[PDB]
Amino acid sequence: KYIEYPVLQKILIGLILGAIVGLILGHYGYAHAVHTYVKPFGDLFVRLLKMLVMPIVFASLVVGAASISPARLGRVGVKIVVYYLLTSAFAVTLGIIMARLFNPGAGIHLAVGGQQFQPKQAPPLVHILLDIVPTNPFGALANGQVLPTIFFAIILGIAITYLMNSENEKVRKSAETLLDAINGLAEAMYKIVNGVMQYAPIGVFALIAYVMAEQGVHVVGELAKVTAAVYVGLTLQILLVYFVLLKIYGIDPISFIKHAKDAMLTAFVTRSSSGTLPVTMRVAKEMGISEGIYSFTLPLGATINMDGTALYQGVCTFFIANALGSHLTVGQQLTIVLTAVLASIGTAGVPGAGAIMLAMVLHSVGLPLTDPNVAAAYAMILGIDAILDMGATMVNVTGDLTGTAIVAKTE
Amino acid sequence: KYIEYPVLQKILIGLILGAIVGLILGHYGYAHAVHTYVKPFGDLFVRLLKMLVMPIVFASLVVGAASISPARLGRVGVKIVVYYLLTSAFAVTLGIIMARLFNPGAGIHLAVGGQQFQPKQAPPLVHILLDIVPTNPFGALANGQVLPTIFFAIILGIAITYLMNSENEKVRKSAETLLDAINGLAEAMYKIVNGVMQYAPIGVFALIAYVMAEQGVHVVGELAKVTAAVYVGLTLQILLVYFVLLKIYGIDPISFIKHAKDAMLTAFVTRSSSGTLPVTMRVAKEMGISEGIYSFTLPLGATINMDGTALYQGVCTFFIANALGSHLTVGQQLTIVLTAVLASIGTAGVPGAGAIMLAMVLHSVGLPLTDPNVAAAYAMILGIDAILDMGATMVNVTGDLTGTAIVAKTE
Numbered sequence: 001k002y003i004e005y006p007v008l009q010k011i012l013i014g015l016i017l018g019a020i021v022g023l024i025l026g027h028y029g030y031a032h033a034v035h036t037y038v039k040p041f042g043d044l045f046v047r048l049l050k051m052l053v054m055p056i057v058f059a060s061l062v063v064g065a066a067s068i069s070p071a072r073l074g075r076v077g078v079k080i081v082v083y084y085l086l087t088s089a090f091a092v093t094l095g096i097i098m099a100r101l102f103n104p105g106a107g108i109h110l111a112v113g114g115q116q117f118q119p120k121q122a123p124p125l126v127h128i129l130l131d132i133v134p135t136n137p138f139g140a141l142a143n144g145q146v147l148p149t150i151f152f153a154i155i156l157g158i159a160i161t162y163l164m165n166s167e168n169e170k171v172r173k174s175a176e177t178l179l180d181a182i183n184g185l186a187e188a189m190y191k192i193v194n195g196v197m198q199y200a201p202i203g204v205f206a207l208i209a210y211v212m213a214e215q216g217v218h219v220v221g222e223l224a225k226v227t228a229a230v231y232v233g234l235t236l237q238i239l240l241v242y243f244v245l246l247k248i249y250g251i252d253p254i255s256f257i258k259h260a261k262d263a264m265l266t267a268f269v270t271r272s273s274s275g276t277l278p279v280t281m282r283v284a285k286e287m288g289i290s291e292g293i294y295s296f297t298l299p300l301g302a303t304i305n306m307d308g309t310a311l312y313q314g315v316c317t318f319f320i321a322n323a324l325g326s327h328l329t330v331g332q333q334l335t336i337v338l339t340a341v342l343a344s345i346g347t348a349g350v351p352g353a354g355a356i357m358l359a360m361v362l363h364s365v366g367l368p369l370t371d372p373n374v375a376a377a378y379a380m381i382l383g384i385d386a387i388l389d390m391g392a393t394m395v396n397v398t399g400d401l402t403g404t405a406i407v408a409k410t411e
Numbered sequence: 412k413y414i415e416y417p418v419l420q421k422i423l424i425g426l427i428l429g430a431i432v433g434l435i436l437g438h439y440g441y442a443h444a445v446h447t448y449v450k451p452f453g454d455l456f457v458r459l460l461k462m463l464v465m466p467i468v469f470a471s472l473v474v475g476a477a478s479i480s481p482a483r484l485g486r487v488g489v490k491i492v493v494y495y496l497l498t499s500a501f502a503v504t505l506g507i508i509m510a511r512l513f514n515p516g517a518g519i520h521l522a523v524g525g526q527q528f529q530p531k532q533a534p535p536l537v538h539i540l541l542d543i544v545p546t547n548p549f550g551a552l553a554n555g556q557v558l559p560t561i562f563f564a565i566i567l568g569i570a571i572t573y574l575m576n577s578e579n580e581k582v583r584k585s586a587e588t589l590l591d592a593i594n595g596l597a598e599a600m601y602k603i604v605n606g607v608m609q610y611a612p613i614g615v616f617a618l619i620a621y622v623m624a625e626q627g628v629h630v631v632g633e634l635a636k637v638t639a640a641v642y643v644g645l646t647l648q649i650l651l652v653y654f655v656l657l658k659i660y661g662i663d664p665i666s667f668i669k670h671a672k673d674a675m676l677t678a679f680v681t682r683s684s685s686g687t688l689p690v691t692m693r694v695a696k697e698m699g700i701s702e703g704i705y706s707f708t709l710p711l712g713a714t715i716n717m718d719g720t721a722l723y724q725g726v727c728t729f730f731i732a733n734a735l736g737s738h739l740t741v742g743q744q745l746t747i748v749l750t751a752v753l754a755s756i757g758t759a760g761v762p763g764a765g766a767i768m769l770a771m772v773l774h775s776v777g778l779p780l781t782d783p784n785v786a787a788a789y790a791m792i793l794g795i796d797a798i799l800d801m802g803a804t805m806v807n808v809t810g811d812l813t814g815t816a817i818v819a820k821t822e
């Protein structure tokens with residue numbers, strides 16, 4: 001019945017509108033009314049967007065690992081990793097350098113005096129690794145499990161490939177029937193990801209409707225100071241790092257955001273990298289990148305490369321050490337970077353688990369969570385949370401896409 | 412080996428000493444060190460003093476109610492009742508009127524905006540009263556239950572009395588044997604409360620050792636203002652109301668405080684009205700009050716009459732609303748008073764359950780505990796808490812003694 005107004009109009013139309021409906025209804029104390037009446041529409045959006053992730057990631061990866069060289073996954077990968085880490089590491093120091101320039105937390109006097117302690121630590125690495133190799137891939141699918149799905153689809157595509165250069169040309173028949181139908185699916189899902197996305201307008205209005213009602217109010221004083229240093233910091237990653245890394249790798253910076261937003265805007269309002277993926281992937285395809293690349297740099301990036309989390313993780317770690325007057329200085333400044341990289345790689349792909357991860361990075365330096373004023377300050381951040389989360393996610397994703405496009409213009 | 416230096420010299424000697432040991436050890440980050448090594452001495456003290464409560468309350472209340480008129484119990488009770496309420500109600504207004512005088516919370520900016528909600532409420536009165544009637548008095552003794560014990564000793568004493576006025580003079584013999592031996596106990600316990608109390612010097616050193624270690628450092632900025640306004644507010648409940656209500660009822664104010672400290676320094680350091688009681692009761696006896704009074708106005712005021720708690724509960728509910736900028740004004744000002752009374756009468760007799768109770772009084776007004784900045788501020792308060800609790804408990808008990816002395820000077 002629009003009939004069809006263009007999507008990046010209606011999407012950008014509901015965003016700036018529900019942000020104002022949300023802020024008005026929120027600051028006039030209705031946020032519960034908003035979480036009753038509006039919310040479930042901003043839910044249905046993310047609902048449909050999830051529904052696809054499991055097929056579209058599995059299907060697209062079988063195909064894409066079939067239609068690329070085992071040699072080249074293994075190069076594109078080592079590329080994306082050493083690119084992913086480097087971007088993540090930069091975003092922390094670009095966060096420290098924003099909480100140094102701004103000063104959130106300082107000017108709330110609240111010091112405390114006990115640590116470390118002792119303390120503990122050790123990411124069980126061995127177990128996280130053995131874990132990407134699933135033991136029932138039907139299983140893996142059947143309940144979320146994207147990383148172990150990846151490592152199957154990659155193993156499968158590689159084996160089908162091998163089936164096609166085999167002597168007996170009965171199996172190459174089967175090998176095709178499979179890989180055709182698998183592509184049948186993948187392709188289908190990219191059609192559904194357009195379906196939803198005509199819902200996006202509504203879903204986007206009704207998401208920042210709720211996120212702005214129930215947490216805009218908290219953006220105040222020293223908390224407001226944490227927003228600005230984070231926001232001005234994230235939109236300094238975009239410009240100082242991506243556009244530069246796109247310009248340098250000779251892919252058009254402004255045509256790149258021209259690919260979009262779609263995934264830039266579903267990342268923002270959903271605050272779910274995993275829920276974004278379908279849209280994130282359909283703007284990899286639609287921008288021409290190769291499937292044997294994008295269907296493995298994007299589902300890995302959707303978890304491992306959260307530049308926006310490990311930035312707020314930088315500047316939040318500063319706020320809570322500022323509010324206690326604990327000056328962190330040389331050694332810790334450097335062990336924030338390391339651990340907030342860690343903490344984001346790290347974080348899960350869903351809403352504010354980055355904030356829950358923020359605990360791992362605090363404990364890394366002095367302050368331990370148990371001390372009331374520690375926690376008092378953390379609580380405060382846990383009220384400005386979903387407001388940070390929006391921008392955090394939109395860069396956690398935009399760094400995945402630039403990671404993809406810049407690796408694939410080298411391959 | 413002292414051999415025996417004076418107690419009110421060594422009691423007052425450790426307090427100013429350990430509070431400097433504590434603060435020096437604390438701010439140098441050792442609070443754990445002090446809770447590992449010091450603390451258990453502070454404990455032993457409260458261990459011993461508790462050991463006595465159950466007998467000394469029961470034993471003395473059987474006696475004193477046998478040694479007074481059912482008539483008189485009747486009058487003293489209702490006297491102390493509308494006395495305690497009257498004191499409790501004033502302390503809140505003396506609190507508000509301190510948090511209005513200072514300004515704790517204002518100057519920390521952090522507003523919030525959902526309520527009420529809905530909300531709930533209703534102390535199950537029916538059940539609390541029905542409860543003062545125990546169903547195994549042996550039981551009630553054998554596990555804490557001081558209020559149900561009270562109601563037994565009171566009915567036991569009156570029944571004994573009655574047996575001494577009965578025709579058969581075999582029963583007046585048994586009635587004597589009993590009441591005698593019962594007083595045997597009571598008397599005994601009052602000798603034991605002296606035992607311990609020669610330990611108190613150590614006990615007192617080793618309690619503020621830790622409380623000051625583990626919380627002193629939190630007394631800073633906006634929190635430091637909440638302390639001062641409670642503290643200067645508490646020592647203004649002492650002069651303005653007690654010394655005036657002692658002066659007015661023909662009992663010497665400085666010779667009242669001379670009675671002590673004993674119960675005044677067991678109250679402060681332990682932060683347990685219940686734990687204090689033996690020293691609170693032997694300061695009733697040792698100051699000449701009649702058993703059939705004090706042995707029923709102390710174990711009752713020990714729970715019901717908590718002026719100091721309902722004083723901080725007023726000035727803490729202000730802090731949290733002031734840090735949110737939510738101004739409370741006419742009707743709330745008055746529905747703090749009723750509720751912070753309720754909350755203290757209310758509170759249990761043990762350390763910082765008043766700080767937990769502070770919730771009830773927060774809920775009564777607008778702010779709900781679910782909102783991060785509510786909980787953010789409350790947390791801060793939960794870090795200055797046993798520092799408040801000290802002064803709090805010393806005036807929960809001081810008003811229990813003035814409530815006894817001025818009622819028995821009228822009986």
Ligand SMILES: N[C@@H](CC(=O)O)C(=O)O
Nearest residue numbers: 272273309350351352354
């Ligand atoms: N919800 C975020 C994680 C975070 O930063 O809290 C994401 O999808 O990237």
Ligand SMILES: N[C@@H](CC(=O)O)C(=O)O
Nearest residue numbers: 683684720760761762765
């Ligand atoms: N600790 C206090 C109770 C309170 O005010 O928290 C008492 O024993 O009376």
Ligand code: NA
Nearest residue numbers: 301302305396
């Ligand atoms: Na991501």
Ligand code: NA
Nearest residue numbers: 303344345347
């Ligand atoms: Na992550």
Ligand code: NA
Nearest residue numbers: 712713716807
């Ligand atoms: Na009391």
Ligand code: NA
Nearest residue numbers: 714755756758
């Ligand atoms: Na009480």
